[PDB]
Amino acid sequence: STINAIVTDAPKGGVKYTKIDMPEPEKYEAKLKPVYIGICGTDRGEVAGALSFTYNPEGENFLVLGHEALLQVLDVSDNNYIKRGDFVVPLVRRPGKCVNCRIGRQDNCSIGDPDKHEAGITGLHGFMRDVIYDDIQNLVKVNDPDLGKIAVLTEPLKNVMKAFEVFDVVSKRSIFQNDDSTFIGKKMVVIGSGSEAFLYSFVGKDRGFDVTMVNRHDETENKMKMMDDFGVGFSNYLKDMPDKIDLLVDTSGDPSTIFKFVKKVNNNGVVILFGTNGKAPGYPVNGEDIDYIVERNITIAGSVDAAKIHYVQALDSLSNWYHRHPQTIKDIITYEAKPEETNIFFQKPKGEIKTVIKWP
């Protein structure tokens, strides 16, 4: 069977909305269709040919892009969980055979490649294509009927849910809370201000943190209004440098910013490294920096990807925010594009939060 799809040639790079030949399967559990698809710097990165670990599935010449999906079930085997017309989010990372992979924690794989594989990124076709085939275990059912396009933010949000679990593990080193058991006054600072930063901030707000997003420039008003709505502050760190940080999260991947901010972190502080950029210039870390970290019992936790449970938590969080802030949540999506507007892979509008592809 022949369909439309947005493909790349991984890692060489490039983008193309074209038609490819998809065969059928033998014994398939599920047939699905895209409805919305989100995009982040990973996609623009793949297209730029800036990612050195990505590849096409074995034997093939191309890779179908897209990992942030919101699908609908075209057909399924009988099961207690989903049926035709239900809406689902698909799992990006699939398990291998390592001690972590065999228990649904492929996000914490002990080998790396090629034990596990990410859809749209590493040797496994993504979701920007008219027809998709999968197993029910890999699908996370959207139970909230009112969510609509908002559900597509599940994929990006689950990364934050995992990272926050990693926080909960590692903050058990000491008592992070107050005298009274609470997070009140506790300070989170999120580097950057794109969708991820937003999600990170929203969740920290749920967790009781006082949250400030930050950048090396003033932001657009839509973003400013968004941060305002949810009780999130903002600071241009060239004008006003936030001090006394309890939880620091980097979505930038930039060492100068990271470590500059690392030096503002309080005793028992936790820093989460999430954002990545292979090209970022080196920043000189010295004896005093390491001493700073050590003398304060600080933890720097790199975090990547997530387990299925974290997709469930992501969806339940989007429900809570929807029914409390319907409008402004809607406005996390800052542009909706047809599949042939491939310019979105190369462009970077001021004001962007999330860009999605409404699928025909």
Dihedral sign computed on CA atoms, order 54, 57, 62, 64? negative
Distance between CA atoms of 220 and 105, rounded to whole angstroms? 38
Segment contacting Zn ion by CB under 5 A, of 35-43, 145-153, 222-230, 269-277 = 35-43
Tell me how crowded residue 147 is: count the other CB atoms within 10 A of its CB: 20
The site map against a copy of itself for 38-57 (x = CB under 8 A) is: ---------------x----
- Backbone φ and ψ for 37, nearest 5 degrees, come out as -140, 130
Residue 184 engages a copy of itself in binding (rule: CB under 8 A):
yes
Residue 114 in the binding site for a copy of itself (CB under 8 A): no
Q: Site map for a copy of itself, 195-214, x if CB under 8 A?
A: -----------x-x------
Query: Judged by CB under 5 A, which of 76, 101, 166, 332 binds Zn ion?
Result: 101
Which residues does 307 contact at the CB level (< 8 Å), separation at least 6? 104, 105, 106, 107, 108, 162
Quick one: which segment of 1-9, 67-75, 85-93, 290-298 binds Zn ion (CB under 5 A)?
A: 67-75
Instruction: Say how many CA atoms lie within 13 Å of 165 toward its Cβ.
Output: 19
To a copy of itself, the closest distance from the beta carbon of 339 in angstroms equals: 29
Binding partner selected for residue 96 from Zn ion, a copy of itself, none, CB under the kind-specific 5 to 8 Å limit: Zn ion
DSSP 138: G
Q: In whole angstroms, what is the distance from residue 325 CA to residue 318 CA?
A: 10
Among residues 23, 78, 295, 327, the one that binds a copy of itself under rule CB under 8 A: 295
Tell me the closest approach of the beta carbon of residue 43 to Zn ion, in angstroms: 6
Q: How far is the CB of 265 from a copy of itself (least distance, A)?
A: 10
The answer to the question of whether 350 is labelled as a binding residue is no
Least Cβ distance, residue 78 to Zn ion (angstroms): 26
Q: Is-contact 125 22, C-beta < 8 A?
A: no
Give every CB contact of residue 240 below 8 A, 6+ residues apart in sequence: none
The helix or strand, by DSSP H or E, that contains position 86, with its residue range, turns out to be none
Q: Does 59 bind a copy of itself (CB under 8 A)?
A: no
96 binds Zn ion (CB under 5 A): yes
- What residues does 335 pair with on adjacent strands? 355
CB 155 within 8 A of CB 69: yes
- Per CB under 8 A, the segment of 30-38, 54-62, 120-128, 175-183 that binds a copy of itself is 175-183
Q: Is 274 labelled a binding residue?
A: yes
Binding region for NADP(+): 193-194, 196, 215-217, 237, 251, 254, 257, 274-276, 303-305, 348
